[PDB]
Design a protein around this nucleic acid. Structure first.
Ligand SMILES: [K+]
Ligand SMILES: [K+]
Ligand SMILES: [K+]
Ligand SMILES: [K+]
Ligand SMILES: [K+]
Ligand SMILES: [K+]
Ligand SMILES: [K+]
Ligand SMILES: [K+]
Ligand SMILES: [K+]
Ligand SMILES: [K+]
Ligand SMILES: [K+]
Ligand SMILES: [K+]
Ligand SMILES: [K+]
Ligand SMILES: [K+]
Ligand SMILES: [Mg+2]
Ligand SMILES: [Mg+2]
Length: 1320
DNA sequence: CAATACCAATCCTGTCCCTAGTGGCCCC
DNA sequence: ATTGGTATTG
């Protein structure tokens, strides 16, 4: 009675099977609970659990953070109103009331309906004088008269509520009055250097050219056009580009060896410019200085389109410009349409349904949709030239609140706000006293490193307070501990040392950590010369000399440097061979050289007395990102260095953390030697033990202390903390629960083996392509995100339109004639990603098809491939695989096959470890683990090839059985494999461990199933396959294949759709207009949706069976009812708080409490003739049955549809009649179970219509036909050209008298409840 | 109670931590 | 994308 378990783990399924030692699947009677006829039922021990995908937490986080922003924005407004309260009460005692109730209809308002002034005359006059808020803002900035306090409030509130971005540090003071003079000064500073070839700036309208509503590049070309004998990539062209906010590279201008890319807005610009000047000289400093100056005058030319000398509110003035031009152009456009085409006027100016001006102002038409609609009308008419110019510049009839306003920095709104306060504090003293408070309301932003301002009821918060009092924007620095909070921000996320779990890991860039890595790599180097009899380790003296002479003088140390600069120079070896390092050392002392460049004091860095200091410094530079806090924490060391060194130290930042703590690296000491780990790495006799040897050596104390330092998650908590998609982690937890249930089903006996198999954006594509092209091209100009989902076109755009194996251009319109080749051939590496694929004219040109692209191709194309790699168009892996010919060995191919068959993904190993640790808990007399259950892992290709070899074909579309069948085949193949070759356990069993030959072995490892094999030459194998030593039979080709065939043909498979309560958003999010419908849901308690609109379409968390009574007619007589009420996600807590009260408030009486059944989505019901339905909601049903199509039809559909061999084609043609039979099957299933008369008859007519089609296409569309009979939600499908739309089951009445089936996770344990016995 | 046809909030900036895959060193 | 909600048409 021994057995094994097969498992197929997916993101929406767990297939499972129990097999005996004869590869059979047992069947058992299981008790059936409930109130029906049936006491028990037969069940095969094979099935699959289906489930909806687990979701990431991202959408939840987006909602959460947006909620916090709405709360805090309301609070900004509340702070402002509180400052205004006393004096506003003297001016207008109900003003803020009128603002708060502005949303209410007149019936519900408690004050006069006109919010600003409370009477119609003043309200109309206000709007006449100030058509937009920006008119008022500009007036209050520029005017010197005392202003009404309510208008002052409205201006300040508009600025605070929509305050612009915080992407620019420091203060911003707009001034575009002398762009021409700054440009001339740049030209003068340039001509100062290049007297021989100066630029004549006379007549160049730089102000107009550089401030036009065009792209930065467009203006760059326009400007260079005006400078004769000057080219766009020249030095002055690059300086203009710099001033425009581009990123020019000054490498070619100065014949440099490295890149000199420069961007003014990058926070690294100062140090980059200092590096460049160190290369070329400080005489060029002024030049870039002048660039900065010009840049400061045109920085915001895009948003500030008005001269700054006329107004201190140029943003509001630019909005007013938008408004005025909109008005003038609207008058002109109306007149032109009235004249040249009157019949269209209405459609353009009245029809909200159309994308005219009506749809633009009143309908749902966007600015883009409106321009696309009206541009043909303009081109068709005469007198529309300037209108078309504005249209093509996205600047025609513009609104002021628009999608592109995100560019406005908060400093501009702050400038207008500060100016208004300065104007009006002369008249209202409270504005003088609170000016800085109001400014702070606008400017204050909670630092990202502080997080929510919680008080112990937020699982997201980490902020600590200095005093227990309410936090405001004004006391924030006094109440909140910014330092401790910024520390917690990082430390709550960083790892502890796995060896010393109470110690934090070191910063990745810690000097100590990098010393550790260098000495750890160095202590396993070995060397030989002529006079030496065997290879020798490096001694402590040698390693110290190597670190001092090489690692502390070069950032990277190459093997050639090791041989010449040390062995030759110091040891006088003319030749030496080195092992333990290839090409260059991996580790390096990067931080040592960074700090040397900064502080220019090698003796300070090499002085061990300073160790702690430097560690702390690096910790500070890793922990904190805010330069002010960096300065605060480094101030305690400012006495050791000067001002410029501290300036450079502040800008020196690191990110990243290591794997080990300082206490582990250089703290704990071996008791007898008194030496740290780093001490041993520096010098360990002639043993030269490295970190792994040191912490495992029983002759040292380290291992004992690690064990003393070591230290209870649940299964759910353990799985949740794994690295992996939430979708696959859901399947992992379900797999473990399935295994638990199956073990209970076998009387709590554990299996012999468990075999597990685990199955295997357009905006990102557009971003990659834009970045690569701008780093490179005008290919999007000549051939302008959805389209990028085409693979060959995607590869074309990623490759700059060139062949990758031949140095030639490729043609867009010829992509169908080209080839997509595997860089590493797919016969070795089953990688189908862009990282291993290439678009070439002909794959023949790769060279020989058995290896990496040939040496000739490498010699041809390595330079172009390096150019591609630099622009980040191919990865280092891709370039290395492309260029491997100059360096595929036989070991590579053997390993490629091995990895085709040996699973190495971390997540599958984690599933294997979970199962292995759950099954195997006992230890033997030697305290070794007792592995009662072997956990085998298989890659999909094994069972896939098994199916394709022995004609156990799968067609996923027929039904869901293929998951269960996959699990069964996994069990069979895995147990057979380790029975035949018991050595392979080392590769296939979790926890077990201690070129042409291995290639041949792993390539023919599965041949023992076959009777004849063709390698190549023919090989023949016996009928009965046995173990190499024990002699136990592992496979009988005369019986076991028939066993598999019988298992795969069994019609009763336990397919179970996991019932799930629905969670998440309450409803569709659209805020719909008002309507007479009880389906509208109020968005606020008192906002009756008949007056105000609201949501509809709530999601049902679960349905509820109610047996009760409802009042009928005017007399209100009671009438028994049985119906399904859907409890929405919003209603759920209220229903569960007290269900009888909830139901009675719904209009039910005398509800039978004990008969209330909670019915989550997918609840299973059986009706007549074995017909089954699943609950889709309280009002809709899904198909509940599986079509058990016989195996012969499945294999026919596979082979005929081309889902080669002659015997297969003869079988397809001899069994053509099968087509009809398959339709018959479908039909007899539908008429019994689907009950879609119209759709079925349309399908039958479509099949009789296309009988004269090729058999291949008829099978390819019969595959589509199974969407009619598939389990689950109805969906539309197509047979050839005819479309069958889904038939929906829009009533749930019939399941109220049907049989409810509660299923356990495997479906083996059932409780059946006849609902016809309830309420009659 | 029919089909049955339409509908579904969207973009964007910045700071940081973590694993894992790739294919190699060196180890338990 | 899918698929359950909704109004509409009957
Ligand atoms: K019974
Ligand atoms: K009223
Ligand atoms: K020129
Ligand atoms: K609109
Ligand atoms: K708007
Ligand atoms: K290396
Ligand atoms: K940092
Ligand atoms: K293993
Ligand atoms: K959930
Ligand atoms: K969900
Ligand atoms: K269940
Ligand atoms: K983000
Ligand atoms: K991220
Ligand atoms: K490794
Ligand atoms: Mg709220
Ligand atoms: Mg708005």
């Amino acid at each position: 009675k021994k057995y094994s378990i097969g498992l197929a783990i997916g993101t929406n399924s767990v297939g499972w099977a129990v097999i005996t030692d004869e590869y059979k699947v047992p069947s058992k009677k299981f008790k059936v609970l409930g109130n029906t006829d049936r006491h028990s039922i037969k069940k095969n021990l094979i099935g699959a659990l289906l489930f909806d995908s687990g979701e990431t937490a991202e959408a939840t986080r987006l909602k959460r953070t947006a909620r916090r922003r709405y709360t805090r924005r309301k609070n900004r407004i509340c702070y402002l109103q509180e400052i205004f309260s006393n004096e506003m009460a003297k001016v207008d005692d109900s003003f803020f009331h009128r603002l708060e109730e502005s949303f209410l209809v007149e019936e519900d308002k408690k004050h006069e309906r006109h919010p600003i002034f409370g009477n119609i005359v003043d309200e109309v006059a206000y709007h006449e004088k100030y058509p937009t808020i920006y008119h008022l803002r500009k007036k209050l900035v520029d005017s010197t008269d005392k202003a009404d306090l309510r208008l002052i409030y409205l201006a300040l509130a508009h600025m605070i509520k929509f305050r612009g971005h915080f992407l620019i540090e420091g203060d911003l003071n707009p001034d575009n009055s002398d762009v021409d003079k700054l440009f001339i000064q740049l030209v003068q500073t340039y001509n100062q250097l290049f007297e021989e070839n100066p630029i004549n700036a006379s007549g160049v309208d730089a102000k107009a050219i550089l401030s036009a509503r065009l792209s930065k590049s467009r203006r760059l070309e326009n400007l260079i056009a005006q400078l004769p004998g000057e080219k766009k990539n020249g030095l002055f062209g690059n300086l203009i580009a710099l001033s425009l906010g581009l990123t020019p590279n000054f490498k070619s201008n100065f014949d440099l060896a490295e890149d000199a890319k420069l961007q003014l807005s990058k926070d690294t610009y100062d140090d980059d410019l200092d590096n460049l000047l160190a290369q070329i000289g400080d005489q060029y400093a002024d030049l870039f200085l002048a660039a900065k100056n010009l840049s400061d005058a045109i920085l915001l030319s895009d948003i500030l389109r008005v001269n700054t000398e006329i107004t201190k509110a140029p943003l509001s003035a630019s909005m007013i410009k938008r408004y005025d031009e909109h008005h003038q152009d609207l008058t002109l456009l109306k007149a032109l349409v009235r004249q040249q085409l009157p019949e269209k006027y209405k459609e353009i100016f009245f029809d909200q349904s159309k994308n005219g001006y009506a749809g633009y102002i009143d309908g749902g038409a966007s600015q883009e949709e409106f321009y696309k609609f009206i541009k043909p009308i303009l081109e068709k008419m005469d007198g529309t030239e300037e209108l078309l110019v504005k249209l093509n510049r996205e600047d025609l009839l513009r609104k002021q609140r628009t999608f592109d306003n995100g560019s406005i920095p908060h400093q501009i709104h702050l400038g207008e706000l500060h100016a208004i306060l300065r104007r009006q504090e002369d008249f209202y003293p409270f504005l003088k006293d609170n000016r800085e408070k109001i400014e702070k309301i606008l400017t204050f932003r909670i630092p990202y490193y502080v997080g929510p301002l919680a008080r112990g009821n937020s699982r997201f918060a980490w902020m600590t307070r200095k005093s227990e009092e309410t936090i405001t924007p004004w006391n924030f620095e006094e109440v909140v501990d910014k330092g401790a909070s910024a520390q917690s921000f990082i430390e709550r996320m960083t790892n502890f040392d796995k060896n010393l779990p109470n110690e934090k890991v070191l910063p990745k860039h810690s000097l100590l950590y990098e010393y550790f890595t260098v000495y750890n790599e160095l202590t396993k180097v070995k060397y030989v010369t002529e006079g030496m009899r065997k290879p020798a380790f490096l001694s402590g003296e040698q390693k110290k000399a190597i670190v001092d002479l090489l690692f502390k003088t070069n950032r990277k140390v190459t093997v050639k440097q090791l041989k010449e600069d040390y062995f030759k120079k110091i040891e006088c070896f003319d030749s030496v061979e080195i092992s333990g390092v290839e090409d260059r050392f991996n580790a390096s002392l990067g931080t040592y050289h960074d700090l040397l460049k900064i502080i220019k004091d090698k003796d300070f860095l090499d002085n061990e007395e300073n160790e702690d200091i430097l560690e702390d410094i690096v910790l500070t530079l890793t922990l904190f990102e805010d330069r002010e806090m960096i300065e605060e924490r480094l101030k305690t060391y400012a006495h050791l260095f000067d001002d410029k060194v501290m300036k450079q130290l502040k800008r020196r930042r690191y990110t990243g953390w290591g794997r080990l703590s300082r206490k582990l690296i250089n703290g704990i000491r071996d008791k007898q030697s008194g030496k740290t780990i780093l001490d041993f790495l520096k010098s360990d006799g002639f043993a030269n033990r490295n970190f792994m040897q040191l912490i495992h050596d029983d002759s040292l104390t380290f291992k004992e202390d690690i064990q003393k330092a070591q230290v209870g998650d649940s299964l759910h908590e353990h799985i949740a903390n794994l690295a992996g998609s939430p979708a696959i982690k859901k399947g992992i937890l379900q797999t473990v629960k399935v295994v638990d249930e199956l073990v209970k089903v076998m009387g709590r006996h554990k299996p012999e083996n468990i075999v597990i198999e685990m199955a295997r954006n357009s905006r990102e594509r557009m971003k990659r392509i834009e970045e690569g092209i701008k780093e490179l091209s005008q290919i999007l100009k000549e051939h302008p995100n959805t389209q990028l989902q085409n693979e060959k076109l995607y590869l074309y755009y990623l490759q700059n339109g060139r062949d990758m194996y031949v140095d030639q251009e490729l043609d867009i319109n010829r992509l169908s004639d080209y080839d997509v080749d595997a860089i590493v051939p797919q016969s070795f590496l089953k990688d189908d990603s862009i990282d291993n694929k290439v678009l070439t004219r002909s794959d023949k040109n790769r060279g020989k098809s058995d290896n990496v692209p040939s040496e000739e191709v490498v010699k041809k194309m390595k330079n172009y491939w390096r150019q591609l790699l630099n622009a980040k168009l191919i990865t280092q892996r891709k370039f290395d695989n492309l260029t491997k010919a100059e360096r595929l060995s036989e070991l590579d191919k053997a390993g490629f096959i091995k990895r085709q068959l040996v699973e190495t993904r971390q997540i599958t190993k984690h599933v294997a470890q979970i199962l292995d640790s759950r099954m195997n808990t006992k230890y033997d007399e030697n305290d070794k683990l007792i592995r009662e259950v072997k956990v085998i892992t298989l890659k999909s290709k094994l069972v896939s090839d098994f199916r394709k070899d022995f004609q156990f074909y799968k067609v996923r579309e027929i039904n869901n059985y293929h998951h269960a069948h996959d699990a069964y085949l996994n069990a069979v193949v895995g147990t057979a494999l380790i029975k035949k070759y018991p050595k392979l356990e080392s590769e296939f069993v979790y926890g077990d461990y201690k070129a042409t030959a291995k290639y041949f072995f792993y390539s023919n490892i599965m041949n023992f199933f076959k009777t004849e094999i063709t390698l190549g030459e023919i090989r023949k194998r016996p009928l009965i396959e046995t173990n190499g030593e024990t002699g136990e039979i592992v496979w009988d080709k005369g019986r076991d294949f028939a066993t598999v065939r019988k298992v795969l043909s069994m019609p009763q498979v336990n397919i179970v759709k996991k019932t799930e309560v629905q969670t998440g958003g309450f409803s569709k999010e659209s805020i719909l207009p008002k309507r007479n419908s009880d389906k509208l849901i109020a968005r606020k308690k008192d906002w009756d949706p008949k007056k105000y609109g609201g949501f509809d379409s709530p999601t049902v968390a679960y349905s509820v069976l109610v047996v009760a009574k409802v009042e009928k007619g005017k007399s209100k007589k009671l009438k028994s009812v049985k119906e399904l009420l859907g409890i929405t996600i919003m209603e759920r807590s209220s229903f569960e708080k007290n269900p009888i009260d909830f139901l009675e408030a719904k209009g039910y009486k005398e509800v039978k409490k004990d008969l209330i059944i909670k019915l989550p989505k997918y609840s299973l019901f059986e009706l007549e003739n074995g017909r089954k339905r699943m609950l889709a909601s309280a009002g809709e049903l899904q198909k509940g049955n599986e079509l058990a199509l016989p195996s012969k039809y499945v294999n026919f559909l596979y082979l005929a549809s081309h889902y080669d061999n002659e015997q297969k084609q003869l079988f397809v043609e001899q069994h053509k009649h099968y087509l009809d039979e398959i339709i018959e099957q479908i039909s007899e299933f539908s008429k019994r179970v689907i009950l879609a008369d119209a759709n079925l008859d349309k399908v039958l007519s479509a099949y009789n219509k296309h009988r004269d089609k090729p058999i291949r296409e008829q099978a390819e569309n019969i595959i589509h036909l199974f969407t009619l009979t598939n389990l689950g939600a109805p969906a539309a499908f197509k047979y050839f050209d005819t479309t069958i739309d889904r038939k929906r089951y829009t009533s749930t009445k019939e399941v109220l008298d049907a049989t409810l089936i509660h299923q356990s996770i495997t479906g083996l344990y059932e409780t059946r409840i006849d609902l016809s016995q309830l309420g009659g």
